Amino acid sequence: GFPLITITVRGRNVHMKQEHYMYLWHVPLTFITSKSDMVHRFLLKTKTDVLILPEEVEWIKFNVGMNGYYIVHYEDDGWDSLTGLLKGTHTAVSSNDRASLINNAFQLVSIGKLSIEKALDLSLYLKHETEIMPVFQGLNELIPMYKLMEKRDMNEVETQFKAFLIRLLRDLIDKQTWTDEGSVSERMLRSQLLLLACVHNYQPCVQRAEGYFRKWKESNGNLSLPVDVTLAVFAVGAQSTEGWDFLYSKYQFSLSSTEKSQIEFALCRTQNKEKLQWLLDESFKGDKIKTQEFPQILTLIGRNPVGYPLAWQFLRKNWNKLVQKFELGSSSIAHMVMGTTNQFSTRTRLEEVKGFFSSLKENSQLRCVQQTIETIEENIGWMDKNFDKIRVWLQSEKLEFKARKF
Amino acid sequence: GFPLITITVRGRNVHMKQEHYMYLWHVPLTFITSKSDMVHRFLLKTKTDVLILPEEVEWIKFNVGMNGYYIVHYEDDGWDSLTGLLKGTHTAVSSNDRASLINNAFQLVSIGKLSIEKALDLSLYLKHETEIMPVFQGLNELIPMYKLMEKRDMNEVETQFKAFLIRLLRDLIDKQTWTDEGSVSERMLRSQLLLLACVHNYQPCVQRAEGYFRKWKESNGNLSLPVDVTLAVFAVGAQSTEGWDFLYSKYQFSLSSTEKSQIEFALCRTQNKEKLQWLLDESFKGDKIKTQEFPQILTLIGRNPVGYPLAWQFLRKNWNKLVQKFELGSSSIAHMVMGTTNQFSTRTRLEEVKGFFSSLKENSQLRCVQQTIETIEENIGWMDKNFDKIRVWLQSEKLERFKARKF
């Protein structure tokens, strides 16, 4: 697997520990302190060892020093100290290292060495975060949580979770201009942030998008929408039947793959079950929309809150004809078999998914079929243990309790 | 010169046009489509002409019916269609056609009918590519890009470019066994892929190579390292001073030119400046190292990311003695005059090279000096146009690794 490092600070007595998770090597650990201006280095050669600082330290940040993925676990008392850093003056640690703390924190919740209550509490720091790197990495760990809830009988916890996610980014969403100015980095943030607010019924985005869509639609698609915003404008348009049929009527007349790809995303986010079924039938048949573009559709329908059973329902009835157009071993088959399944988190989808692929005889032993049964089993345990926690965490968070006064 | 053909498909209205770039003939264009089960053979006899297809088509692949080099330009809207082919089910078009699409795409970037942003996006399909010919032809167009960056003050984009280059082939790198099994095709892919991965600090190649080198080093060169692997093992070994001095000490005790040639590459990629300078002095004088091997050394020494100024500075100071040992007109001098220069891409290296050869009077008028001044002038324009673009392309690709995209 990958190397995992535990850190346990006790005053000025910095204990260390290495464990190559998922066994021993000479792990070069670096750290930075509230006191330190420079990077301190330590070559950890044993399972456990100890390092000592001159004075006690307000916060200790360990990153290893290799390439690729590694998780630095700071234990309970150390995570709390790091949280206070990112809440008061997060500019101390670097932009990319802030993302690293989030990746470590939330993936430790899955491993089991950290309760979700502490990771969710760390996420609350985003409210002041500006740089693109933590925002996406924060959005990187949070979206798969409610994506699993969509596939379950969970609407109140889902709607309260989705409002919470918008609550952190609300300050940043309202500052994003609806243009294509600034550097390439933030423009990626803009495009993806406007898409986020508008998808989650954030009124200042939707109403703003509908107005832009009207001016573009009523002009028969002749007004130059800025590129970054276009994703959100098209997404809200395809919700109505009138906007959807028109949105496709311009998909044909397009010779711009970027414009073509954004519409395709839009045409799949509709909660209409009749319109999506047609996208599957027509992209599969390969006349009005290319069969090449079918994976980029079966996937995004399988991620629709309402269209996820149709993608699963389409794959089972249309397995044999699909392998001739794509071939088992190809990446398209693999990408397709995962997108319709790897977000299920029930004790019944396990037999449904395992049962279907076992019956396929020699057509049952793909690396993508094994890789998805694992991620489903991971999701079952993750949800069965951490669901009730997110329910009560989101409760006790609305409370600002009206104290800090008395 | 070579013939270039542009194609513009609009529904079933496939427009084509011939232009012998760098003028008119009966160009036999053949093509295959998503619908087509049969090779179509349209004989293009005029500058521009049009043919009509029965049903609409998802993608059209054009080849010309001559041999040698030709570039098929598929226009902007048409290249996008072919990229989607090689990403979803690249097995549709042939192995050699996949290499052909890559060679044309990147060489169209130099001609100017294709932006670098789109060609680099086509390269992203390599991650699923297995066959050697596209892998090499992809490696053939990408490597000269950073070898121009090595000779310039470009380090963050260079390391970020090289990681991307390994990122594409990484999946294929991990499947290559460290043996001499499979066919010569698989062996050729193995040898150069391990050689490539190990060069770019790809740790899974380093750890396996360093361990192999020590066991070969500690056994005083008595255990038979697999031949394909040997290139990478020697390359990483010669980086340390301790590994270099020994690696040269076994160069002598060899009566095997294949083993002899592998060491030659290894001893030159070391970032040590003193050790390289000595290789130049001794190969030239001809006692420790043959004078025959000086060209095959001065060139690749000039190809070192850090040793390139020594080769160029050595060639200038040692011109006169070089003409007597090799003679102007011979191909060896030509190979030497190009290898130390043809990757410079500055407005000052151009005048530096032009200035040196002009001063030689009657000794200054070769085909290799003109052919290298041309490739230098080509490099200046290519970088001046496409450098800043690749900088932000590597930016906006790391962000294509966000995992939101589902919302």
Side-chain angles (χ1 to χ4, degrees), chain B residues 144-154 157 343-346 376-390:
Chain B
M145 295 189 196
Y146 69 72
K147 286 221 160 209
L148 267 60
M149 295 179 167
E150 285 178 357
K151 313 205 169 337
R152 296 272 292 283
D153 180 17
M154 300 169 177
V157 289
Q343 290 171 354
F344 294 133
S345 60
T346 80
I376 290 168
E377 282 172 330
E378 292 186 9
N379 288 338
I380 294 167
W382 189 98
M383 280 276 257
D384 284 28
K385 179 183 278 201
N386 293 342
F387 171 59
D388 291 306
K389 307 194 173 290
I390 301 157

PDB file of all heavy atoms in Angstrom, chain B residues 144-154 157 343-346 376-390:
ATOM      1  N   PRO B 144      11.800  15.861 -27.512  1.00  0.00           N
ATOM      2  CA  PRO B 144      12.487  17.083 -27.966  1.00  0.00           C
ATOM      3  C   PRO B 144      11.944  18.369 -27.362  1.00  0.00           C
ATOM      4  O   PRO B 144      12.595  19.412 -27.503  1.00  0.00           O
ATOM      5  CB  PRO B 144      12.287  17.059 -29.488  1.00  0.00           C
ATOM      6  CG  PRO B 144      12.077  15.631 -29.815  1.00  0.00           C
ATOM      7  CD  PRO B 144      11.324  15.060 -28.654  1.00  0.00           C
ATOM      8  N   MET B 145      10.789  18.336 -26.694  1.00  0.00           N
ATOM      9  CA  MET B 145      10.240  19.562 -26.126  1.00  0.00           C
ATOM     10  C   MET B 145      11.013  19.991 -24.887  1.00  0.00           C
ATOM     11  O   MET B 145      11.392  21.161 -24.758  1.00  0.00           O
ATOM     12  CB  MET B 145       8.758  19.380 -25.796  1.00  0.00           C
ATOM     13  CG  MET B 145       7.864  19.146 -27.003  1.00  0.00           C
ATOM     14  SD  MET B 145       6.113  19.209 -26.571  1.00  0.00           S
ATOM     15  CE  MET B 145       5.375  18.453 -28.016  1.00  0.00           C
ATOM     16  N   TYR B 146      11.270  19.058 -23.966  1.00  0.00           N
ATOM     17  CA  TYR B 146      12.000  19.416 -22.756  1.00  0.00           C
ATOM     18  C   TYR B 146      13.507  19.432 -22.961  1.00  0.00           C
ATOM     19  O   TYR B 146      14.213  20.084 -22.185  1.00  0.00           O
ATOM     20  CB  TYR B 146      11.620  18.480 -21.597  1.00  0.00           C
ATOM     21  CG  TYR B 146      12.084  17.037 -21.693  1.00  0.00           C
ATOM     22  CD1 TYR B 146      13.419  16.692 -21.519  1.00  0.00           C
ATOM     23  CD2 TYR B 146      11.171  16.015 -21.924  1.00  0.00           C
ATOM     24  CE1 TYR B 146      13.835  15.377 -21.598  1.00  0.00           C
ATOM     25  CE2 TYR B 146      11.578  14.697 -22.002  1.00  0.00           C
ATOM     26  CZ  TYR B 146      12.911  14.384 -21.837  1.00  0.00           C
ATOM     27  OH  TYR B 146      13.321  13.073 -21.913  1.00  0.00           O
ATOM     28  N   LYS B 147      14.019  18.738 -23.981  1.00  0.00           N
ATOM     29  CA  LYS B 147      15.439  18.852 -24.292  1.00  0.00           C
ATOM     30  C   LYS B 147      15.794  20.252 -24.772  1.00  0.00           C
ATOM     31  O   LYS B 147      16.972  20.626 -24.745  1.00  0.00           O
ATOM     32  CB  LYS B 147      15.844  17.804 -25.326  1.00  0.00           C
ATOM     33  CG  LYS B 147      15.911  16.403 -24.741  1.00  0.00           C
ATOM     34  CD  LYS B 147      17.108  15.622 -25.253  1.00  0.00           C
ATOM     35  CE  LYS B 147      17.424  14.465 -24.318  1.00  0.00           C
ATOM     36  NZ  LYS B 147      18.867  14.108 -24.328  1.00  0.00           N
ATOM     37  N   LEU B 148      14.801  21.023 -25.217  1.00  0.00           N
ATOM     38  CA  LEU B 148      14.993  22.451 -25.423  1.00  0.00           C
ATOM     39  C   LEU B 148      14.868  23.203 -24.107  1.00  0.00           C
ATOM     40  O   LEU B 148      15.511  24.243 -23.923  1.00  0.00           O
ATOM     41  CB  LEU B 148      13.971  22.984 -26.428  1.00  0.00           C
ATOM     42  CG  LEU B 148      14.354  23.058 -27.908  1.00  0.00           C
ATOM     43  CD1 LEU B 148      14.697  21.688 -28.461  1.00  0.00           C
ATOM     44  CD2 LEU B 148      13.219  23.677 -28.696  1.00  0.00           C
ATOM     45  N   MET B 149      14.049  22.688 -23.186  1.00  0.00           N
ATOM     46  CA  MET B 149      13.903  23.301 -21.871  1.00  0.00           C
ATOM     47  C   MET B 149      15.133  23.069 -21.005  1.00  0.00           C
ATOM     48  O   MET B 149      15.484  23.929 -20.188  1.00  0.00           O
ATOM     49  CB  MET B 149      12.662  22.746 -21.172  1.00  0.00           C
ATOM     50  CG  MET B 149      11.346  23.090 -21.846  1.00  0.00           C
ATOM     51  SD  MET B 149       9.943  22.370 -20.973  1.00  0.00           S
ATOM     52  CE  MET B 149       8.580  23.242 -21.741  1.00  0.00           C
ATOM     53  N   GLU B 150      15.789  21.914 -21.161  1.00  0.00           N
ATOM     54  CA  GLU B 150      17.008  21.636 -20.409  1.00  0.00           C
ATOM     55  C   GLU B 150      18.056  22.714 -20.639  1.00  0.00           C
ATOM     56  O   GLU B 150      18.743  23.137 -19.702  1.00  0.00           O
ATOM     57  CB  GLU B 150      17.567  20.268 -20.798  1.00  0.00           C
ATOM     58  CG  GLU B 150      16.823  19.075 -20.227  1.00  0.00           C
ATOM     59  CD  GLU B 150      17.407  17.755 -20.701  1.00  0.00           C
ATOM     60  OE1 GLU B 150      18.359  17.784 -21.512  1.00  0.00           O
ATOM     61  OE2 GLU B 150      16.922  16.692 -20.260  1.00  0.00           O
ATOM     62  N   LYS B 151      18.186  23.179 -21.879  1.00  0.00           N
ATOM     63  CA  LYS B 151      19.177  24.185 -22.237  1.00  0.00           C
ATOM     64  C   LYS B 151      18.741  25.603 -21.889  1.00  0.00           C
ATOM     65  O   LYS B 151      19.447  26.552 -22.245  1.00  0.00           O
ATOM     66  CB  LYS B 151      19.519  24.076 -23.725  1.00  0.00           C
ATOM     67  CG  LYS B 151      19.788  22.645 -24.165  1.00  0.00           C
ATOM     68  CD  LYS B 151      20.680  22.587 -25.393  1.00  0.00           C
ATOM     69  CE  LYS B 151      21.161  21.167 -25.645  1.00  0.00           C
ATOM     70  NZ  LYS B 151      21.117  20.343 -24.407  1.00  0.00           N
ATOM     71  N   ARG B 152      17.607  25.770 -21.212  1.00  0.00           N
ATOM     72  CA  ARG B 152      17.098  27.085 -20.851  1.00  0.00           C
ATOM     73  C   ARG B 152      16.839  27.133 -19.351  1.00  0.00           C
ATOM     74  O   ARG B 152      16.870  26.113 -18.658  1.00  0.00           O
ATOM     75  CB  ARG B 152      15.806  27.422 -21.606  1.00  0.00           C
ATOM     76  CG  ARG B 152      15.947  27.529 -23.111  1.00  0.00           C
ATOM     77  CD  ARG B 152      16.323  28.942 -23.509  1.00  0.00           C
ATOM     78  NE  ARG B 152      15.254  29.906 -23.268  1.00  0.00           N
ATOM     79  CZ  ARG B 152      14.178  30.048 -24.036  1.00  0.00           C
ATOM     80  NH1 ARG B 152      14.015  29.285 -25.107  1.00  0.00           N
ATOM     81  NH2 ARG B 152      13.263  30.959 -23.731  1.00  0.00           N
ATOM     82  N   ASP B 153      16.576  28.343 -18.853  1.00  0.00           N
ATOM     83  CA  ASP B 153      16.228  28.546 -17.445  1.00  0.00           C
ATOM     84  C   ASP B 153      14.742  28.237 -17.254  1.00  0.00           C
ATOM     85  O   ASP B 153      13.894  29.117 -17.095  1.00  0.00           O
ATOM     86  CB  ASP B 153      16.578  29.958 -16.998  1.00  0.00           C
ATOM     87  CG  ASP B 153      16.239  30.210 -15.536  1.00  0.00           C
ATOM     88  OD1 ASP B 153      16.031  29.230 -14.789  1.00  0.00           O
ATOM     89  OD2 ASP B 153      16.187  31.391 -15.134  1.00  0.00           O
ATOM     90  N   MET B 154      14.434  26.942 -17.287  1.00  0.00           N
ATOM     91  CA  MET B 154      13.062  26.446 -17.175  1.00  0.00           C
ATOM     92  C   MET B 154      13.140  25.162 -16.356  1.00  0.00           C
ATOM     93  O   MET B 154      13.454  24.098 -16.898  1.00  0.00           O
ATOM     94  CB  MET B 154      12.447  26.193 -18.547  1.00  0.00           C
ATOM     95  CG  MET B 154      12.371  27.419 -19.439  1.00  0.00           C
ATOM     96  SD  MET B 154      11.946  27.002 -21.139  1.00  0.00           S
ATOM     97  CE  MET B 154      11.842  28.634 -21.865  1.00  0.00           C
ATOM     98  N   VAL B 157       8.528  24.056 -14.941  1.00  0.00           N
ATOM     99  CA  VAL B 157       7.781  23.466 -16.046  1.00  0.00           C
ATOM    100  C   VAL B 157       8.468  22.201 -16.545  1.00  0.00           C
ATOM    101  O   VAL B 157       7.800  21.260 -16.989  1.00  0.00           O
ATOM    102  CB  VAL B 157       7.588  24.489 -17.181  1.00  0.00           C
ATOM    103  CG1 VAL B 157       6.601  25.570 -16.759  1.00  0.00           C
ATOM    104  CG2 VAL B 157       8.923  25.101 -17.581  1.00  0.00           C
ATOM    105  N   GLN B 343      19.674  22.012 -30.125  1.00  0.00           N
ATOM    106  CA  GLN B 343      18.595  22.188 -29.163  1.00  0.00           C
ATOM    107  C   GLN B 343      18.638  23.542 -28.471  1.00  0.00           C
ATOM    108  O   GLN B 343      17.821  23.791 -27.579  1.00  0.00           O
ATOM    109  CB  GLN B 343      18.605  21.072 -28.111  1.00  0.00           C
ATOM    110  CG  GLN B 343      18.191  19.711 -28.646  1.00  0.00           C
ATOM    111  CD  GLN B 343      18.416  18.600 -27.642  1.00  0.00           C
ATOM    112  OE1 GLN B 343      18.987  18.820 -26.574  1.00  0.00           O
ATOM    113  NE2 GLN B 343      17.962  17.397 -27.977  1.00  0.00           N
ATOM    114  N   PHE B 344      19.562  24.420 -28.853  1.00  0.00           N
ATOM    115  CA  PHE B 344      19.552  25.780 -28.337  1.00  0.00           C
ATOM    116  C   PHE B 344      18.367  26.545 -28.907  1.00  0.00           C
ATOM    117  O   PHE B 344      18.023  26.404 -30.084  1.00  0.00           O
ATOM    118  CB  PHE B 344      20.854  26.499 -28.689  1.00  0.00           C
ATOM    119  CG  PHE B 344      22.070  25.928 -28.019  1.00  0.00           C
ATOM    120  CD1 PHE B 344      23.225  25.684 -28.744  1.00  0.00           C
ATOM    121  CD2 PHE B 344      22.068  25.659 -26.660  1.00  0.00           C
ATOM    122  CE1 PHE B 344      24.351  25.169 -28.129  1.00  0.00           C
ATOM    123  CE2 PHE B 344      23.190  25.141 -26.039  1.00  0.00           C
ATOM    124  CZ  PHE B 344      24.333  24.896 -26.775  1.00  0.00           C
ATOM    125  N   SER B 345      17.737  27.361 -28.061  1.00  0.00           N
ATOM    126  CA  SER B 345      16.548  28.114 -28.443  1.00  0.00           C
ATOM    127  C   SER B 345      16.562  29.487 -27.768  1.00  0.00           C
ATOM    128  O   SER B 345      15.646  29.873 -27.049  1.00  0.00           O
ATOM    129  CB  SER B 345      15.284  27.332 -28.092  1.00  0.00           C
ATOM    130  OG  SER B 345      15.213  27.083 -26.700  1.00  0.00           O
ATOM    131  N   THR B 346      17.631  30.245 -28.006  1.00  0.00           N
ATOM    132  CA  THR B 346      17.746  31.612 -27.522  1.00  0.00           C
ATOM    133  C   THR B 346      18.161  32.516 -28.673  1.00  0.00           C
ATOM    134  O   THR B 346      18.690  32.058 -29.690  1.00  0.00           O
ATOM    135  CB  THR B 346      18.778  31.756 -26.391  1.00  0.00           C
ATOM    136  OG1 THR B 346      20.094  31.807 -26.954  1.00  0.00           O
ATOM    137  CG2 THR B 346      18.706  30.586 -25.433  1.00  0.00           C
ATOM    138  N   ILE B 376      17.855  25.457 -35.256  1.00  0.00           N
ATOM    139  CA  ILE B 376      17.910  26.393 -34.136  1.00  0.00           C
ATOM    140  C   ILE B 376      16.890  27.510 -34.324  1.00  0.00           C
ATOM    141  O   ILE B 376      16.176  27.881 -33.384  1.00  0.00           O
ATOM    142  CB  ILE B 376      19.336  26.948 -33.961  1.00  0.00           C
ATOM    143  CG1 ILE B 376      20.275  25.860 -33.436  1.00  0.00           C
ATOM    144  CG2 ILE B 376      19.337  28.133 -33.008  1.00  0.00           C
ATOM    145  CD1 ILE B 376      21.739  26.231 -33.515  1.00  0.00           C
ATOM    146  N   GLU B 377      16.805  28.065 -35.536  1.00  0.00           N
ATOM    147  CA  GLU B 377      15.818  29.108 -35.797  1.00  0.00           C
ATOM    148  C   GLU B 377      14.400  28.563 -35.673  1.00  0.00           C
ATOM    149  O   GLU B 377      13.500  29.259 -35.189  1.00  0.00           O
ATOM    150  CB  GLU B 377      16.047  29.722 -37.180  1.00  0.00           C
ATOM    151  CG  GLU B 377      17.204  30.716 -37.231  1.00  0.00           C
ATOM    152  CD  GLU B 377      17.539  31.169 -38.642  1.00  0.00           C
ATOM    153  OE1 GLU B 377      17.340  30.379 -39.588  1.00  0.00           O
ATOM    154  OE2 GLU B 377      18.010  32.316 -38.805  1.00  0.00           O
ATOM    155  N   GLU B 378      14.184  27.316 -36.102  1.00  0.00           N
ATOM    156  CA  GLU B 378      12.897  26.663 -35.885  1.00  0.00           C
ATOM    157  C   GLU B 378      12.569  26.563 -34.401  1.00  0.00           C
ATOM    158  O   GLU B 378      11.425  26.794 -33.991  1.00  0.00           O
ATOM    159  CB  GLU B 378      12.901  25.269 -36.511  1.00  0.00           C
ATOM    160  CG  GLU B 378      12.946  25.237 -38.031  1.00  0.00           C
ATOM    161  CD  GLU B 378      12.792  23.827 -38.584  1.00  0.00           C
ATOM    162  OE1 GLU B 378      12.472  22.913 -37.793  1.00  0.00           O
ATOM    163  OE2 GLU B 378      12.993  23.633 -39.802  1.00  0.00           O
ATOM    164  N   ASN B 379      13.563  26.213 -33.581  1.00  0.00           N
ATOM    165  CA  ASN B 379      13.337  26.038 -32.149  1.00  0.00           C
ATOM    166  C   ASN B 379      12.963  27.349 -31.467  1.00  0.00           C
ATOM    167  O   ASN B 379      12.160  27.354 -30.527  1.00  0.00           O
ATOM    168  CB  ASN B 379      14.579  25.431 -31.499  1.00  0.00           C
ATOM    169  CG  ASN B 379      14.771  23.972 -31.861  1.00  0.00           C
ATOM    170  OD1 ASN B 379      13.823  23.284 -32.243  1.00  0.00           O
ATOM    171  ND2 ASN B 379      16.005  23.492 -31.748  1.00  0.00           N
ATOM    172  N   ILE B 380      13.541  28.465 -31.914  1.00  0.00           N
ATOM    173  CA  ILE B 380      13.245  29.756 -31.297  1.00  0.00           C
ATOM    174  C   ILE B 380      11.767  30.095 -31.455  1.00  0.00           C
ATOM    175  O   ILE B 380      11.088  30.463 -30.488  1.00  0.00           O
ATOM    176  CB  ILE B 380      14.145  30.855 -31.892  1.00  0.00           C
ATOM    177  CG1 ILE B 380      15.608  30.609 -31.516  1.00  0.00           C
ATOM    178  CG2 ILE B 380      13.697  32.229 -31.414  1.00  0.00           C
ATOM    179  CD1 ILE B 380      16.590  31.450 -32.301  1.00  0.00           C
ATOM    180  N   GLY B 381      11.248  29.978 -32.679  1.00  0.00           N
ATOM    181  CA  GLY B 381       9.840  30.265 -32.904  1.00  0.00           C
ATOM    182  C   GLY B 381       8.914  29.310 -32.176  1.00  0.00           C
ATOM    183  O   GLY B 381       7.903  29.729 -31.603  1.00  0.00           O
ATOM    184  N   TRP B 382       9.239  28.015 -32.191  1.00  0.00           N
ATOM    185  CA  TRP B 382       8.397  27.025 -31.524  1.00  0.00           C
ATOM    186  C   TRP B 382       8.250  27.335 -30.041  1.00  0.00           C
ATOM    187  O   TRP B 382       7.146  27.276 -29.487  1.00  0.00           O
ATOM    188  CB  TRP B 382       8.980  25.625 -31.720  1.00  0.00           C
ATOM    189  CG  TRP B 382       8.084  24.515 -31.253  1.00  0.00           C
ATOM    190  CD1 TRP B 382       7.254  23.756 -32.022  1.00  0.00           C
ATOM    191  CD2 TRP B 382       7.926  24.042 -29.908  1.00  0.00           C
ATOM    192  NE1 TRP B 382       6.591  22.839 -31.243  1.00  0.00           N
ATOM    193  CE2 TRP B 382       6.985  22.994 -29.942  1.00  0.00           C
ATOM    194  CE3 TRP B 382       8.492  24.402 -28.679  1.00  0.00           C
ATOM    195  CZ2 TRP B 382       6.596  22.303 -28.796  1.00  0.00           C
ATOM    196  CZ3 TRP B 382       8.103  23.716 -27.542  1.00  0.00           C
ATOM    197  CH2 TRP B 382       7.165  22.677 -27.609  1.00  0.00           C
ATOM    198  N   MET B 383       9.359  27.675 -29.380  1.00  0.00           N
ATOM    199  CA  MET B 383       9.309  27.970 -27.952  1.00  0.00           C
ATOM    200  C   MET B 383       8.644  29.313 -27.687  1.00  0.00           C
ATOM    201  O   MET B 383       7.821  29.433 -26.773  1.00  0.00           O
ATOM    202  CB  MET B 383      10.721  27.945 -27.369  1.00  0.00           C
ATOM    203  CG  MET B 383      11.243  26.552 -27.079  1.00  0.00           C
ATOM    204  SD  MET B 383      10.715  25.928 -25.474  1.00  0.00           S
ATOM    205  CE  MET B 383      12.226  26.153 -24.542  1.00  0.00           C
ATOM    206  N   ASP B 384       8.982  30.332 -28.480  1.00  0.00           N
ATOM    207  CA  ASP B 384       8.409  31.657 -28.276  1.00  0.00           C
ATOM    208  C   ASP B 384       6.887  31.634 -28.367  1.00  0.00           C
ATOM    209  O   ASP B 384       6.211  32.436 -27.711  1.00  0.00           O
ATOM    210  CB  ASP B 384       8.998  32.638 -29.290  1.00  0.00           C
ATOM    211  CG  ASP B 384      10.412  33.064 -28.932  1.00  0.00           C
ATOM    212  OD1 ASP B 384      11.119  32.277 -28.267  1.00  0.00           O
ATOM    213  OD2 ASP B 384      10.817  34.182 -29.314  1.00  0.00           O
ATOM    214  N   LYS B 385       6.332  30.731 -29.176  1.00  0.00           N
ATOM    215  CA  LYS B 385       4.890  30.605 -29.337  1.00  0.00           C
ATOM    216  C   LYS B 385       4.268  29.639 -28.334  1.00  0.00           C
ATOM    217  O   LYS B 385       3.227  29.943 -27.742  1.00  0.00           O
ATOM    218  CB  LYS B 385       4.569  30.133 -30.760  1.00  0.00           C
ATOM    219  CG  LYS B 385       3.083  29.938 -31.034  1.00  0.00           C
ATOM    220  CD  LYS B 385       2.840  29.397 -32.438  1.00  0.00           C
ATOM    221  CE  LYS B 385       2.864  30.495 -33.483  1.00  0.00           C
ATOM    222  NZ  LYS B 385       2.162  30.078 -34.729  1.00  0.00           N
ATOM    223  N   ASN B 386       4.886  28.476 -28.131  1.00  0.00           N
ATOM    224  CA  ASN B 386       4.240  27.373 -27.429  1.00  0.00           C
ATOM    225  C   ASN B 386       4.716  27.166 -25.995  1.00  0.00           C
ATOM    226  O   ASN B 386       4.162  26.306 -25.304  1.00  0.00           O
ATOM    227  CB  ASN B 386       4.439  26.076 -28.219  1.00  0.00           C
ATOM    228  CG  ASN B 386       3.702  26.084 -29.542  1.00  0.00           C
ATOM    229  OD1 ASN B 386       2.787  26.881 -29.754  1.00  0.00           O
ATOM    230  ND2 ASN B 386       4.110  25.206 -30.451  1.00  0.00           N
ATOM    231  N   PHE B 387       5.714  27.912 -25.521  1.00  0.00           N
ATOM    232  CA  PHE B 387       6.204  27.675 -24.166  1.00  0.00           C
ATOM    233  C   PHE B 387       5.161  28.049 -23.120  1.00  0.00           C
ATOM    234  O   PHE B 387       4.739  27.207 -22.318  1.00  0.00           O
ATOM    235  CB  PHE B 387       7.501  28.442 -23.911  1.00  0.00           C
ATOM    236  CG  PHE B 387       7.935  28.417 -22.475  1.00  0.00           C
ATOM    237  CD1 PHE B 387       8.182  27.213 -21.836  1.00  0.00           C
ATOM    238  CD2 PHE B 387       8.083  29.592 -21.760  1.00  0.00           C
ATOM    239  CE1 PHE B 387       8.573  27.183 -20.512  1.00  0.00           C
ATOM    240  CE2 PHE B 387       8.477  29.568 -20.435  1.00  0.00           C
ATOM    241  CZ  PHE B 387       8.723  28.362 -19.811  1.00  0.00           C
ATOM    242  N   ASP B 388       4.732  29.314 -23.117  1.00  0.00           N
ATOM    243  CA  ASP B 388       3.772  29.779 -22.120  1.00  0.00           C
ATOM    244  C   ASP B 388       2.484  28.968 -22.150  1.00  0.00           C
ATOM    245  O   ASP B 388       1.810  28.837 -21.121  1.00  0.00           O
ATOM    246  CB  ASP B 388       3.477  31.263 -22.335  1.00  0.00           C
ATOM    247  CG  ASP B 388       4.668  32.146 -22.013  1.00  0.00           C
ATOM    248  OD1 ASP B 388       5.197  32.044 -20.888  1.00  0.00           O
ATOM    249  OD2 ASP B 388       5.081  32.937 -22.888  1.00  0.00           O
ATOM    250  N   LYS B 389       2.130  28.414 -23.309  1.00  0.00           N
ATOM    251  CA  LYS B 389       0.916  27.612 -23.409  1.00  0.00           C
ATOM    252  C   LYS B 389       1.055  26.313 -22.624  1.00  0.00           C
ATOM    253  O   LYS B 389       0.158  25.936 -21.860  1.00  0.00           O
ATOM    254  CB  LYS B 389       0.609  27.326 -24.879  1.00  0.00           C
ATOM    255  CG  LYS B 389       0.550  28.573 -25.751  1.00  0.00           C
ATOM    256  CD  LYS B 389      -0.094  28.284 -27.098  1.00  0.00           C
ATOM    257  CE  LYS B 389      -0.312  29.562 -27.895  1.00  0.00           C
ATOM    258  NZ  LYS B 389      -1.371  30.418 -27.296  1.00  0.00           N
ATOM    259  N   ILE B 390       2.184  25.619 -22.792  1.00  0.00           N
ATOM    260  CA  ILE B 390       2.412  24.364 -22.080  1.00  0.00           C
ATOM    261  C   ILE B 390       2.484  24.600 -20.576  1.00  0.00           C
ATOM    262  O   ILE B 390       2.112  23.724 -19.784  1.00  0.00           O
ATOM    263  CB  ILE B 390       3.679  23.669 -22.616  1.00  0.00           C
ATOM    264  CG1 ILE B 390       3.537  23.386 -24.114  1.00  0.00           C
ATOM    265  CG2 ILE B 390       3.946  22.372 -21.875  1.00  0.00           C
ATOM    266  CD1 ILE B 390       4.860  23.225 -24.835  1.00  0.00           C
TER     267      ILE B 390
END
